[PDB]
């Protein structure tokens, strides 16, 4: 099946450089005009660059000369080279496949977040939140940049989960996630929150253990 998968996003200092890649599968990649579309936090979609199957390229005015879009048809990969990055470049970057002349974006990547900031990478402190239906918590505190990923029991616990958007304070993010399970499931069987912060390569699991 058709898939686009982005990588290469993360924290970069203003003036710094970053290289995004997109890995395509499930279709004849050489046939399609491919684009990057970005979305700044809280804002709308913005087209960035396009490359025809014929190799011809197009750029948003404000990235002209800083960004270079390219492709490796043998590796089924699209690239975006970003130099001279500005704060205004912070966004989620999406790879898209185009129908026809490339403008109808019929397949999108999941997106990779690029954060242009002077602040330092800081791993999260993860704290287990112990107290019919029992609600447990995970507090993920003091990290930078976004994102973190939160799952419960490696994904098996999907329903009854609220993961709250992070709040920024003094260049550090904090978020929380609740999970509600039947009172007979916990502490009966193990419940754990899994937190990944790839920016610092942090991956930690915190089992929820009842209090004394």
């Amino acid at each position: 099946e058709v898939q686009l998968v982005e990588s290469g996003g993360g924290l970069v200092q203003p003036g710094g450089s970053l290289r995004l890649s997109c890995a395509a599968s499930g279709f004849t990649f050489s046939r399609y005009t491919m684009s990057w579309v970005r979305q700044a936090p809280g804002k709308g979609l913005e087209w960035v660059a396009t490359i025809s199957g014929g190799g011809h390229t197009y750029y948003l005015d404000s990235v002209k000369g800083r960004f270079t879009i390219s492709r490796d048809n043998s590796k089924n990969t699209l690239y975006l080279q970003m130099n001279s990055l500005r704060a205004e470049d912070t966004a989620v970057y999406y790879c898209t496949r185009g129908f026809g002349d490339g403008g109808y974006f019929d397949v999108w990547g999941q997106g990779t977040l690029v954060t242009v900031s002077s602040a330092k990478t800081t791993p999260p402190s993860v704290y287990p939140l112990a107290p019919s239906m029992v609600t447990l918590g995970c507090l993920v505190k003091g990290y930078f940049p976004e994102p973190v990923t939160v799952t419960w029991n490696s994904g098996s616990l999907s329903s009854g989960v609220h993961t709250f958007p992070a709040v920024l304070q003094s260049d550090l993010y904090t978020l929380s996630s609740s999970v509600t399970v039947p009172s007979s499931t916990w502490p009966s069987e193990t419940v754990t929150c899994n937190v990944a912060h790839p920016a610092s390569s942090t991956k930690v699991d915190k089992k929820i253990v009842p209090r004394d």
Partner: protein, 214 residues
């Protein structure tokens, strides 16, 4: 340099409502070059609607039709809860291709009360010198809600950080977390910790509390 302006910028409507979002272009755009996308929060956009010329029986493909204009619409004949989203229009008639600014569609709903729970600081955080007290207010509607923290009965909003989820795509409710963060030293200067939730589903606030020394 064709600019797309969507109206309204956001809207709330009841299930069953007919909903129409407008995309207005600064100059003419061909009907086959105006597209709509739907984006769920935190997810990539998906292609949603496009318009096309169709040929009747036996008509050779060298024929096509279109319209030219500045007014385009997306309509939902009967709004459903899973239609919560931001919708974007896009034109590819001109270069550069452009998107509209987005229209957020939220669902109106039966008023529901929060499920409230409170959590003391974990031993791990305390050993590190910090004390966060966390309150979850889950699955309520309308979205407007007030949370007050009381410490030994007296109001404390110093050090409180609040966060609301996006509307739920199934039940159309909202959830919120409120976190009161103190030093460990300060945490140990008080006994009872209370979060009071004031929601339109009553004038009597919903209160969850614990005592640090129990």
């Amino acid at each position: 340099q064709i600019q797309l302006t969507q109206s309204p910028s956001s809207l709330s409507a009841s299930v069953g409502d007919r909903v129409t979002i407008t995309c207005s272009a600064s100059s003419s755009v061909n009907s086959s070059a105006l597209f709509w996308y739907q984006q769920k929060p935190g997810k990539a956009p998906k292609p949603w609607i496009y318009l096309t010329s169709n040929l009747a029986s036996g008509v050779p493909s060298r024929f096509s039709g279109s319209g030219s204009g500045t007014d385009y619409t997306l309509t939902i004949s009967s709004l459903q809860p899973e239609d919560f989203a931001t919708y974007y229009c896009q034109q590819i008639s001109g270069n550069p291709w452009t998107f509209g600014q987005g229209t957020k569609v939220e669902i109106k709903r039966a008023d529901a009360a929060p499920t409230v729970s409170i959590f003391p600081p974990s031993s791990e955080q305390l050993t590190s010198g910090g004390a966060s007290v966390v309150c979850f207010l889950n699955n309520f509607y309308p979205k407007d809600i007030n949370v007050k923290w009381k410490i030994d009965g007296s109001e404390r909003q110093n050090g409180v950080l609040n966060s609301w989820t996006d509307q739920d795509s199934k039940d159309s409710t909202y959830s919120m977390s409120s976190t009161l963060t103190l030093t460990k030293d300060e945490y140990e200067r008080h006994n009872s910790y209370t979060c009071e939730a004031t929601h339109k589903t009553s004038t009597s606030p919903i209160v969850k509390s614990f005592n640090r020394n129990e």
